[PDB]
Amino acid sequence: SLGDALTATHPRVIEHVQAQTHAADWQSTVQATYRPPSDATRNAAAYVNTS
Amino acid sequence: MREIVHIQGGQCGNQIGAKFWEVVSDEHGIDPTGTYHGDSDLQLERINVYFNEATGGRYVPRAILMDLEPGTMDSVRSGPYGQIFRPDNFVFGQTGAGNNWAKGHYTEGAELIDSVLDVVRKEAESCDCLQGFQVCHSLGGGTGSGMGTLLISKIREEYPDRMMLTFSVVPSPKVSDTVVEPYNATLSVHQLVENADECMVLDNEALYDICFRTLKLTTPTFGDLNHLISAVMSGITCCLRFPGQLNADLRKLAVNLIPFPRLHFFMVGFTPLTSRGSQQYRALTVPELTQQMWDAKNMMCAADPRHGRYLTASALFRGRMSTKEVDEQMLNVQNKNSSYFVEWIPNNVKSSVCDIPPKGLKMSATFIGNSTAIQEMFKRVSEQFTAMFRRKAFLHWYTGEGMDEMEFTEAESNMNDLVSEYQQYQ
Amino acid sequence: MREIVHIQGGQCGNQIGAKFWEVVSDEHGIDPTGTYHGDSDLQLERINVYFNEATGGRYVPRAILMDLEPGTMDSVRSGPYGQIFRPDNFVFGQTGAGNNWAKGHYTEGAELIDSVLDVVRKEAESCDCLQGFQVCHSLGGGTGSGMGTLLISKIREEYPDRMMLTFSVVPSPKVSDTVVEPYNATLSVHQLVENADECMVLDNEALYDICFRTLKLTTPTFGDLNHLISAVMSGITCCLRFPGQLNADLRKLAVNLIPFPRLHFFMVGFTPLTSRGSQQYRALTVPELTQQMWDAKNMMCAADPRHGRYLTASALFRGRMSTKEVDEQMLNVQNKNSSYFVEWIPNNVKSSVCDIPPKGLKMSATFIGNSTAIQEMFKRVSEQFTAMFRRKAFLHWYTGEGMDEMEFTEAESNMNDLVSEYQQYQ
Amino acid sequence: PPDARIQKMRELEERLANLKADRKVEQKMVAVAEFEARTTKKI
Amino acid sequence: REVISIHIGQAGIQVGNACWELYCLEHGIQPDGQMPDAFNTFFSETGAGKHVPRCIFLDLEPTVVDEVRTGTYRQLFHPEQLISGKEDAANNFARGHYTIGKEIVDLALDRIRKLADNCTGLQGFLVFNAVGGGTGSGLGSLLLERLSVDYGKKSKLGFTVYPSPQVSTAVVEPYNSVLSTHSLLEHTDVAVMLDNEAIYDICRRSLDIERPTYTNLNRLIAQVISSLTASLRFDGALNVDITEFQTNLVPYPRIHFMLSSYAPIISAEKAYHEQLSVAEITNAAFEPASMMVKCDPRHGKYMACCLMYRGDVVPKDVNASVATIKTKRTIQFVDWCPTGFKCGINYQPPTVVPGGDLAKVQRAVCMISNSTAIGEIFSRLDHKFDLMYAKRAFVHWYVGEGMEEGEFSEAREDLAALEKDFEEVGA
Amino acid sequence: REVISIHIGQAGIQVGNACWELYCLEHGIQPDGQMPDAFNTFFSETGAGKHVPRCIFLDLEPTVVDEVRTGTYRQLFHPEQLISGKEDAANNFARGHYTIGKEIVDLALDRIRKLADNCTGLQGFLVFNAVGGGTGSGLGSLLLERLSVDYGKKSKLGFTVYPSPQVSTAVVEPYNSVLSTHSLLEHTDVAVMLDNEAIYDICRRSLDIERPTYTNLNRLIAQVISSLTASLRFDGALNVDITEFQTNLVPYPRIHFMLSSYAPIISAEKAYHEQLSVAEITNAAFEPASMMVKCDPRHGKYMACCLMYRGDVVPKDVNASVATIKTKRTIQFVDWCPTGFKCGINYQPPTVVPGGDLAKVQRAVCMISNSTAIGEIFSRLDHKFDLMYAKRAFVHWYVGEGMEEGEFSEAREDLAALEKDFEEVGA
Amino acid sequence: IHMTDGIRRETMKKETLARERSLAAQSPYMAQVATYRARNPPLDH
Numbered sequence A: 001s002l003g004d005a006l007t008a009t010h011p012r013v014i015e016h017v018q019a020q021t022h023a024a025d026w027q028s029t030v031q032a033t034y035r036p037p038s039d040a041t042r043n044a045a046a047y048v049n050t051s
Numbered sequence B, C: 001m002r003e004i005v006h007i008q009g010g011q012c013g014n015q016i017g018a019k020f021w022e023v024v025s026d027e028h029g030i031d032p033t034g035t036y037h038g039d040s041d042l043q044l045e046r047i048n049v050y051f052n053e054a055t056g057g058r059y060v061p062r063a064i065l066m067d068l069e070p071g072t073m074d075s076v077r078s079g080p081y082g083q084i085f086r087p088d089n090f091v092f093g094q095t096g097a098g099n100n101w102a103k104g105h106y107t108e109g110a111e112l113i114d115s116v117l118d119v120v121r122k123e124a125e126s127c128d129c130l131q132g133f134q135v136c137h138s139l140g141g142g143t144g145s146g147m148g149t150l151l152i153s154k155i156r157e158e159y160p161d162r163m164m165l166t167f168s169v170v171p172s173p174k175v176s177d178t179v180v181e182p183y184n185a186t187l188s189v190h191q192l193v194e195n196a197d198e199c200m201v202l203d204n205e206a207l208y209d210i211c212f213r214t215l216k217l218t219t220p221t222f223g224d225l226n227h228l229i230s231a232v233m234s235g236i237t238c239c240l241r242f243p244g245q246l247n248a249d250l251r252k253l254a255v256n257l258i259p260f261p262r263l264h265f266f267m268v269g270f271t272p273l274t275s276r277g278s279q280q281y282r283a284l285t286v287p288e289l290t291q292q293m294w295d296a297k298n299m300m301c302a303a304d305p306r307h308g309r310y311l312t313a314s315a316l317f318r319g320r321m322s323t324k325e326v327d328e329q330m331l332n333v334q335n336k337n338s339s340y341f342v343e344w345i346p347n348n349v350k351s352s353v354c355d356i357p358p359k360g361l362k363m364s365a366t367f368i369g370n371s372t373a374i375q376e377m378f379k380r381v382s383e384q385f386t387a388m389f390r391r392k393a394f395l396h397w398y399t400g401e402g403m404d405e406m407e408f409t410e411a412e413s414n415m416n417d418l419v420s421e422y423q424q425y426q
Numbered sequence D: 001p002p003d004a005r006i007q008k009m010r011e012l013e014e015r016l017a018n019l020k021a022d023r024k025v026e027q028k029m030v031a032v033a034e035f036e037a038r039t040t041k042k043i
Numbered sequence E, F: 001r002e003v004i005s006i007h008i009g010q011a012g013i014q015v016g017n018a019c020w021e022l023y024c025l026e027h028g029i030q031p032d033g034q035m036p037d038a039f040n041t042f043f044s045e046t047g048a049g050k051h052v053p054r055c056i057f058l059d060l061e062p063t064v065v066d067e068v069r070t071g072t073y074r075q076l077f078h079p080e081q082l083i084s085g086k087e088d089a090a091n092n093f094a095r096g097h098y099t100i101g102k103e104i105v106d107l108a109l110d111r112i113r114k115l116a117d118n119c120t121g122l123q124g125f126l127v128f129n130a131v132g133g134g135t136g137s138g139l140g141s142l143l144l145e146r147l148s149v150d151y152g153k154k155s156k157l158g159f160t161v162y163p164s165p166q167v168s169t170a171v172v173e174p175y176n177s178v179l180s181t182h183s184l185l186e187h188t189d190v191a192v193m194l195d196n197e198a199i200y201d202i203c204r205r206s207l208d209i210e211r212p213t214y215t216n217l218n219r220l221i222a223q224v225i226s227s228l229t230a231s232l233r234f235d236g237a238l239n240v241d242i243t244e245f246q247t248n249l250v251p252y253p254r255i256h257f258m259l260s261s262y263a264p265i266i267s268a269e270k271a272y273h274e275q276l277s278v279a280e281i282t283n284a285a286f287e288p289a290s291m292m293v294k295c296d297p298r299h300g301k302y303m304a305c306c307l308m309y310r311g312d313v314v315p316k317d318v319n320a321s322v323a324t325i326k327t328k329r330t331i332q333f334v335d336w337c338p339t340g341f342k343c344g345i346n347y348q349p350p351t352v353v354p355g356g357d358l359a360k361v362q363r364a365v366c367m368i369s370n371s372t373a374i375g376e377i378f379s380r381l382d383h384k385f386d387l388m389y390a391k392r393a394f395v396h397w398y399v400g401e402g403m404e405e406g407e408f409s410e411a412r413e414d415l416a417a418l419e420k421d422f423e424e425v426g427a
Numbered sequence G: 001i002h003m004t005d006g007i008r009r010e011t012m013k014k015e016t017l018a019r020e021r022s023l024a025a026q027s028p029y030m031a032q033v034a035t036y037r038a039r040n041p042p043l044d045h
């Protein structure tokens, strides 16, 4: 005999399966704004070095 | 670095604290066996605030367990994340209080409060830069309210500089669980107003109808309610644990919410909250979180903010966003319903931002409101106290332990003075 | 090189020595059959201090076992590691003293000490440089107190310059076995205060308290208490057996703890000591050792140091460690509670470091404190002695053997002057 | 005697001022010496 | 010639993080400290191929400081140059000015002393901070007054962040701002105003970024500071130094508060559209919509102005532009100062950052002037300070921390005296 | 050129016990009284190798007098100056002024006559009292009135210790204070205020002792008095005698109440942390954090200021510091006074005592001024005195002693007149 | 003293029982966490 204290309670209260950001995707704003200028490849349009 | 010492008292406090520790452990990516199994390195740099590394990645929570009846400790240990709490932190009596503030505050606390003081001291000097104390307990009960409040007094006496933050559940008109709610509640708040730094009032009926409307659950047992309380509890301290654009610790929010020493009774809510069948409607946008944050139905106290005036407010934002939109929405909500805000203070709302949303979300916001409409709950308590004290019902169980009626007079007069001040500043 | 010869007296002494020799043999890697099977070469260079090469890697302990009843020898031989003791070292009487100081000190000692003296002189002269003698016995029984005391005096008369340790257990009123314990205890102490070089007092009630509160054991048999005593005794002579960053021999400990030759009664503690349930949840650092070493509830004597003054103090440390942290912790404990240390002796703590910890451990510590609170138990025994001697109870068994009233009177006279000087220096 | 301590600090201050002036002169010499070489490299 | 800069507070060290990224990028210094003579004013050369900035980051909260320590620029910054306290001051002037500031300023000035000793041609100091908080305002004012005591004769350029009129983030920032001005009056040499609402509007209007954050604001502040330091950094047709701002833009010792503007504020796609030239970029730097402080210069009266020019700039064009401005009557100069313009030209055009939204422009103008609308800003702040001090709100925090109510009134009266001075001068 | 001292009450004679110890260690005289020209102003040479202070200890209880008799300073004082009463005034102004004072004042007077006769160039007197007590209020007033009758034209240094507003040990001390101010207002020429909580703050903040007893307060008061008298005992580059004080610090015959201050006030470990100059001690002598009396001088306007400097100071730096203080806008002087300052330098630096809490400092500053905040102090005391008087509390023992309502009404009216004078002179 | 030993015995027994129940109940919680973690796919940069 056992009660109902053992519940996941995460999917019942707080969850947004479509809008979740995976824990590997976590990053601070400064981390995402100050990239190595030599090999910055996270921007679609940028000034390419043209010799 | 800045250290938070968690304290748990009574059945309600023990269960909500177990839920809080489950949520925090999940957020920092440690499995119920005590070892780290996350992926992002952002978690490990700020785990000292809530955990201590013993051996081989065994991170032990910095919590204290306190009660008098074996059932609650048994429930805490039997469930998952039960074998991570330190066995020595289960300081624990055996007789029980049973809905009596005097029993838990003068007799049982007499021979139990010394061991808990030894444990909390040993665990407090264990850390270098202590930030403050965070406690969660009950008020209508005997063990949590009385013994917990006396411990609050003791640790305020010994540590007069470190901050003190409380989550307390309060009596309710329709859902009235026990019979001696007014006697315990009045003395609990009487001590809290003079000793606690800031209090966030909780009640079960607000959680009940939050599960009714927003989540549309059918049978919301204590687990969901404690999970919501834990979500807010973690959202309060998210600044110390993660980098952000504008951090705000407990002192930053307390100086921006407390204009007078006795003006430290807040009310709380959480965003976003939607049903499982409505997961695709809402886009995680600042206006959508803001509109739910300011709604009276999202508040976690039986006090309508529309029946009073906001004095100060605090907003704790998480996740990557833009400050301009948050500030614009804050100004917009301040300007439109300007009749609901105080006049002799500009910029009543304080904001803060962090870049790490809680797990399972995209971005969240936590609201702390120092509204003057919380006096309605106190007047509700006082009228029942005066009516029941009128013919001294159930009094002999209190004066038979050492107490006098003068303590009841002091509690009633002090809380009446507090409601008078709240009405004055409206 | 420097040589330690072991002497055991009575049933308590025999069991303590059996456990001590088992622990030491485990440390040096010899099997219960007596042949070396260790791994490192550090376990060969300094094993002459305890063993003697026989043949083919067989090492025999440097011990002499004393008693008056066949049961102790039979149990020693029957148990494990009982086939390593040399049978000639089993010096042995036949009739038994039986809880009577006079029998073991005047009658039974007369015909037995000759064989004990013969064997101890034969072994002691075999080694080149005897560091000193080591004696573990009891003050409650007859053959341990009286015969052991007579042997102590005889050795002091024979080899005066050599060192001498006395691990003597003193019975307590709360845990009391024998009716006539004060009669043996007072006279044994009266002889020890001039005969023994330095004394470290053990007590069974303190060991029971330690094994109840700290180790959290439910059935603390004599095995656990003997294990604790054996660990303490092994910890003392660790520097002689292994290299360290700061070595300290027995004389080096004695010179830093005895400012006056009649004050050689130490109170002893050991650390770390944790229950098996709480073994995972503890980090293993120098502060964790220092905070438990100075705890009053960890001491293996029946005397609270908080009621007295730490006149001098000592600490033995084992493991690969930082001297800076050891010194900082010692200075912190010195400067925090300045009221517990005497004023005319600054820097009362002597420290030593060994880099080889006990098997199964990474760090350990030992405490030897010459406090003026050791005179609490002396009064606690002398009050019973005066209360019973004032009516000449059980006296006819002592008088009718050679002893008269003068020995008793001088016994409480020396007891009183010792306790008076200990109180004076407080 | 009433101004002996004052005379001591007067001597102290004048000596320190002379030393600082000498150090400034040395700094000027170092500056011009480096200037000549860098300009030659540029040429 | 060299200048050493100090960054105080969460705003100060973030704008410093943007600014030093710009400094490293413009001189072609890769983020690990070495090149792949003009750099000497910012980067000290050590050993063989290694440059260390002449700056310090200090704060009482270690979170953002050590996050910068573990950012892209790890080896670039000296480990001891990033000071970090152990606990926050939490929006309190008293906490950062008397309690925690007392034991941190000694280390900061001990490091600054050796940083300046390593220097040989120091021009002056250059401070970035925010007065709306506690860590910034309190210990920044304390450090400022201590440096004024130690050096004094060396200039100190001030770039502060006051709270905006409508948009705000805190509640008790009027106290911190007032007590910050109470010391900035006598200790700061030249103060350059920086708001937040104005730059938000600039970003939304010119760069059409619908959701701007603090990063764009800091990038624009870095643009401004680089444009005003390029005269010292690089050779131009007409070079100016630090002393020019004090000599030509500070007419009275108690009147030093500056307005900033920048042009051309344009995106990457509209550089294709418009034909850039000196006349229109000079004209655009005068409308209130291109000013980095939320104020209207029409209600005020200019005293003196400074103009930095970068890129392909011929002096005849700037002379024509300033002549046309002078003949314009929409803006009004004071008869007090008949000649209220100061110019300066540097040859190198402003640099661009990868990921930034500012395009590569041929020429740019940074306009820094003095006006009387700053008294209006201070009066507007004083209005809500007096409206809030009437109720003795939040005073107990400051009183308990170690302060009293007296200096609140004294700083209020000092601000009133400032108001009277600006009213008198504007006549 | 000499001056003699008298002591009345517990506080006065304890302060004197500190002062004479300090003086003896200043002049190298052992407690026996033998030295193994400057001392002539306080000590008269007796016999062969003996010195006796120009002092008299007077009190009604015999206790503190007899521990003075039995202490280490037995042979220092001539025994028959040590005058002891029999029963105390019991904190009762009427009792000490009419019951016990009538029979002890005669002995004090015919002792002062011979003490002055032994002197030749007596400049004046210096008294020590606290107007909070009973015996220091009543019989002290009677005695000083008798000296005013006897001498009239001679100066009298009135060193009074007024009770603090919040911190208080008695309950009827407002009445004693008012009744003392009735006579001290028009009898003595110079009066100095000494508050108790201000010294508590002084020893708490700078002297960093959290458990201060009366001994340290007495030590620092003795240091202040020694600094004031150093211009008398020793020759300086710019000396001032007692006489110049009356004509330089008292603008009106009824306004004679001068505050006290001292600098630098540093403990044993602070002296190593910083090195001293003249500018910062001049500035620190004017901040209210080092003032000896509960007041807010920033609310009021100064009348005049006296500055005594000891140690190693030259007139150039003091003149420059005075100019800088005058140019400061934090403190304002009254319109009719163009110069409210008075400087002074002595060559001999202040001393330190083994066992004391002060450090060996090269130079020190003693500040004595005059402002209108003392009027606020008087009004604060008078309000709380009238608060009790509305119900005739504690008055009837004064009545039964022999007094009536008349002097109480006259004292309240005289204090109101003093309030009106203070508010009218400040315009 | 008998009360104290009985308390010790019951505490030890209930510690063992609680440990056994926790180890029994851990696995379904891990299964549930796996099920609701499978919903979130990590992104590819």
Ligand SMILES: Nc1nc2c(ncn2[C@@H]2O[C@H](COP(=O)(O)OP(=O)(O)OP(=O)(O)O)[C@@H](O)[C@H]2O)c(=O)[nH]1
Pocket: B245, B246, B247, B252, E008, E009, E010, E011, E012, E014, E015, E061, E088, E089, E090, E091, E092, E130, E131, E132, E133, E134, E135, E136, E137, E161, E168, E169, E170, E195, E196, E214, E215, E217, E218
């Ligand atoms: N423009 C701009 N302003 C900023 C930035 N960061 C912080 N601020 C301003 O700083 C004000 C509050 O001070 P904070 O920077 O949060 O911190 P602080 O000044 O050091 O004071 P404390 O919070 O008590 O430590 C806010 O109102 C912002 O306007 C930034 O990156 N850019």
Ligand SMILES: Nc1nc2c(ncn2[C@@H]2O[C@H](COP(=O)(O)OP(=O)(O)OP(=O)(O)O)[C@@H](O)[C@H]2O)c(=O)[nH]1
Pocket: F008, F009, F010, F011, F012, F014, F015, F088, F089, F090, F091, F092, F130, F132, F133, F134, F135, F136, F137, F161, F163, F169, F170, F173, F196, F214, F215, F217, F218
């Ligand atoms: N500075 C200082 N003030 C003191 C000292 N002792 C007493 N006082 C002050 O004196 C006031 C009361 O007078 P007391 O000195 O105690 O005694 P008294 O002046 O002889 O008057 P009575 O006690 O009535 O005989 C108190 O309010 C104190 O503030 C002291 O040692 N140092």
Ligand SMILES: Nc1nc2c(ncn2[C@@H]2O[C@H](COP(=O)(O)OP(=O)(O)O)[C@@H](O)[C@H]2O)c(=O)[nH]1
Pocket: B009, B010, B011, B012, B013, B015, B016, B097, B098, B099, B138, B139, B140, B141, B142, B143, B144, B145, B146, B169, B177, B178, B204, B222, B225, B226
């Ligand atoms: N929200 C919430 N409330 C709880 C929980 N457990 C108990 N409570 C509340 O706590 C009250 C009883 O308090 P009690 O346990 O008797 O306090 P104690 O006697 O001091 O230990 C009831 O009214 C419950 O509503 C919980 O897990 N969640």
Ligand SMILES: Nc1nc2c(ncn2[C@@H]2O[C@H](COP(=O)(O)OP(=O)(O)O)[C@@H](O)[C@H]2O)c(=O)[nH]1
Pocket: C009, C010, C011, C012, C015, C016, C067, C098, C099, C138, C140, C141, C142, C143, C144, C145, C169, C171, C176, C177, C178, C204, C222, C225, C226
């Ligand atoms: N610590 C410890 N104490 C013991 C042991 N064996 C006996 N004792 C104590 O010794 C006392 C009796 O000593 P006893 O056997 O008469 O010694 P003997 O007669 O001289 O051989 C009892 O009170 C026991 O508590 C042991 O193995 N360890």
Ligand SMILES: [Mg+2]
Pocket: E009, E010, E011, E133, E134, E135, E136
């Ligand atoms: Mg900050």
Ligand SMILES: [Mg+2]
Pocket: F009, F010, F088, F133, F135
């Ligand atoms: Mg007195």
